[PDB]
Each structure stands twice: as C-alpha cells, then as structure tokens.
Symmetry: C3
C-alpha cells in the first residue's frame, strides 16, 4: 500500500548535498535516513548523540505511524543503534525528525555528514479503546 | 482503525491514583504506560527491573498484536529503555502487562510510582504459513 | 490475516534436528527462530555474535515486512537481545535469515544449537512517497 506523506525541508542541503530519504530497492521496507550535519561527529563507546535529519514530515492519518530503526550493518557490525531503541513517529508530529544515535559497542565511531545512519518504516497502527471487564473469555 | 480492547484492572489504584494508559494526543500512535509501584525504584546504570502495570489486556484478535517501546525522551535523554528492547504482546496473552525497564546509560534513575515509563502501540500482524521451495522466483 | 511465505531450507537439519520456526500458540504474534549451530556459542557480556537460521524466506509482497525481536524472557532475564535491536526483513530479501545476538547484560550466556533465541513478526508496511511542501496544515 502506498501513501503520499507531506515533507518540509528544513535544511537546504536536504535534497541536494544530503539526498532525501530513499528506499534502497523497490522491495525495501524502510527508507534510509541521512545525518544532516555540518561536520562529522565522533561517538565514543556508550555515548548518545542527537542527529538532525534536516526534514519534517506530517503523516497526518491517525491510522499510520512511522518507526525508526537501526540499520542491520551498523547495528550488528559497529554497535551503532538508537538510544531510544525504536523511534516512534506520531501521525500528528510536525517537528524535525531527529535520530538518537547510540554507540552500544566498544569502538568509537565517526558519524559522517550525509551517512545513512538509520532507517524508517511506515506501519498501520490501531487506536485502542479500553473496555473494562471483571473477567476475560 | 479503531478497536475495543478488553482490560482487567488488577490493582485498584489503576484508573484512580495511577491513570489508565492514554494517547497523549489524538494523533498519538502509542499509549503511555504507568509504573504501578508502591514506592519509587532506583535503577542503577546497567540494571533491569520488572515494573508492573497493574493491568491485563486481552487483544483476542489474532490479526493484532501490541508492541511496547521506550518513550523517546526517557530513552534518549536518560537511557531508560526496555530490557527486552521491544515488548511484543500476543493476542492470546491475558496476564498482567509487565515492563522490563533497563538503564542502558551511565546515570542512576528513579522510577516514580505512576510515571509514564514506556509506551505501547497496537499493530496489525500477519500469520505466516511456510511454503517450502527449492528455489525462489 | 494469513499469508503463505516461500521458505528455502539451506541447512538440512532445519525441519529435522532444528525444527522450522513456529507460532508457540495460535494467538502468538511471532514465530520463534532457532539457532542453526554446529556447537554451542558462549557469548560474553557485551559481545555480539551472528547466528545462522539455516533458512531463507522470500516475502515477495512489498506491502509486507518482517521484524525480528528479542524474546521477552531472554531479553529481560538474561540480557540476550539483538545487536541490531530490531531486525527488519525486506520483502525482496532472499538471503539466509541471520540473527545478531547481543549480550547486553553482565552474565556470560551459552547459545545452544536449536535454542529459540529470537522471534519474528510479519507486519504490513506502507511505502511512502514524499510530497514536498513549504507548510503543513
Ligand atoms: O527517534 C525519534 C523518536 C521520536 N521523534 C519525535 C516524533 C514523535 O512523535 C515525538 C514524540 O515521541 P515519543 O512520544 O516516543 O516521546 P515522548 O518522550 O513521549 O515525548 P512526548 O511527551 O512529546 O510524546 O518525537 C523523533 O523525532 N525521533
Ligand atoms: O514487555 C513485555 C513483553 C511481553 N509480555 C508478555 C506478553 C507476551 O504475550 C508474553 C510473552 O512474550 P514473548 O513471547 O516475547 O516472551 P517469551 O520468552 O517467548 O515467553 P513465552 O515462552 O511465554 O512465549 O509476555 C509483557 O508483559 N511485557
Ligand atoms: O536481523 C536481521 C536484519 C536484517 N537481515 C537481512 C534482511 C534485510 O532485508 C537485510 C538488510 O537489512 P537492513 O536494510 O536493516 O541492513 P543494511 O545495513 O541497510 O543492509 P543493506 O545495505 O543491504 O540494505 O538484512 C537479517 O538477515 N537479519
Ligand atoms: Mg537497508
Ligand atoms: Mg509520547
Ligand atoms: Mg514467545
């Protein structure tokens, strides 16, 4: 299923020096997000840094959310994952998309400007209404 | 999409001193879960603690699951995430919802009673049946 | 919702000595994945190891992805989680399914051959097309 998502470019290098997020292939679940940075950021073991994307999206449909995830290679091989583990993006969020980058491993890592440092999937979400009961079936 | 989910209150403070989980806004993907605790729990760096919710849900529809996730602020800023990383709640689970709270950072943290310590999304899930093949297309 | 997923057995012990992944119950969201190993692997605190499944799947439908997650018991109780935190499996991926096993805790752990070391859910995914705007609504 396809959905057009409104995006506001906040940094003029996004779409230019830092390409807009893209699906690496046509069967790819996730779009790879790029670090919108002026200079490289050295992330020491155990440390977390907030990386700008230079963009804002507005999902708008409350039946939809996005989830930011590590990329497998960075996570597995380099211990470069998310400080919030999974980043949940609400349909009504219109701020800048930010990446909490966490070095969960033993080796210092250089986050380069423009690096595809995380990915994001769009998934349907269901809004629950609680029905109080004394017992289940 | 909307779904009524049966909930059993297990601790009588849930719905009273500890509010039932709620969507912070109407476009929010996740419901914030509250720590059903008698007293605050001090979580040292690197440590994990099992936090009760004082509630049980029964999703019941095998086309639906819930996923518990860190909240971004706690995860990023405080290193307060999940010890199981993501908590998957099965449609047929009827036990108490529990939160594995893990301090992945360097600073000791006080989990207060009633704190919105994690969030939960409901997502559709697909049940796979494997089709054995010698080769793909 | 149900979906047949093509699977290629890559190791002849899969489906024999190492059972194919299964839903523990009929309301279970996830299939438990087994470590296709010749011998046990001792995973020291803080270390990551790549575990084969001995199988390959081909989801094929770009409206579907899988997500690999820790199992709650291993994650919470033993600190045995995923080095990539969540493993996203793309619809067009046809390689061997691999598990990045990460010991996030303080105790050494033996990964036995055949152990149900992680689980996998199939979720619908939406492919986004960006619509550039100057302002949101
Ligand atoms: O990796 C992330 C995670 C979240 N967000 C944004 C989008 C999301 O809608 C908002 C709030 O996320 P969450 O609800 O997980 O964090 P919170 O701590 O509950 O903040 P709030 O009180 O605003 O809901 O932060 C990001 O930009 N990056
Ligand atoms: O953060 C969590 C994660 C899970 N659960 C409950 C709901 C879920 O349905 C059950 C089992 O979860 P999972 O299948 O991930 O753990 P397991 O180690 O495989 O236990 P089991 O053998 O019972 O399936 O534990 C929670 O209360 N909190
Ligand atoms: O735990 C995992 C995660 C991923 N994969 C496979 C399936 C997935 O389709 C592929 C690529 O995953 P991802 O896109 O997260 O990693 P990447 O670093 O971006 O590699 P690539 O550049 O190939 O997309 O790796 C696994 O076998 N196990
Ligand atoms: Mg990728
Ligand atoms: Mg929130
Ligand atoms: Mg299980």
């Amino acid at each position: 299923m396809m959905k057009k998502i409104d995006v506001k470019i906040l940094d003029p290098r996004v779409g230019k020096e830092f390409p807009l997020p893209t699906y690496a292939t046509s069967g790819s679940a996730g779009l790879d997000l790029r670090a919108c940075l002026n200079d490289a950021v050295e992330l020491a073991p155990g440390d977390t840094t907030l990386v700008p994307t230079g963009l804002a999206i507005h999902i708008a449909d409350p039946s939809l959310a996005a989830m930011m995830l590590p990329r497998s290679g960075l996570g597995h091989k380099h211990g470069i994952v998310l400080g919030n583990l999974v980043g949940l993006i609400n349909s009504d969020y219109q701020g800048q998309l930010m990446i909490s980058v966490w070095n969960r491993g033993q080796d210092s890592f250089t986050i380069q400007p423009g690096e595809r440092i995380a990915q994001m999937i769009f998934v349907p979400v269901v809004q629950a209404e609680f029905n109080l009961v004394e017992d289940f079936d």
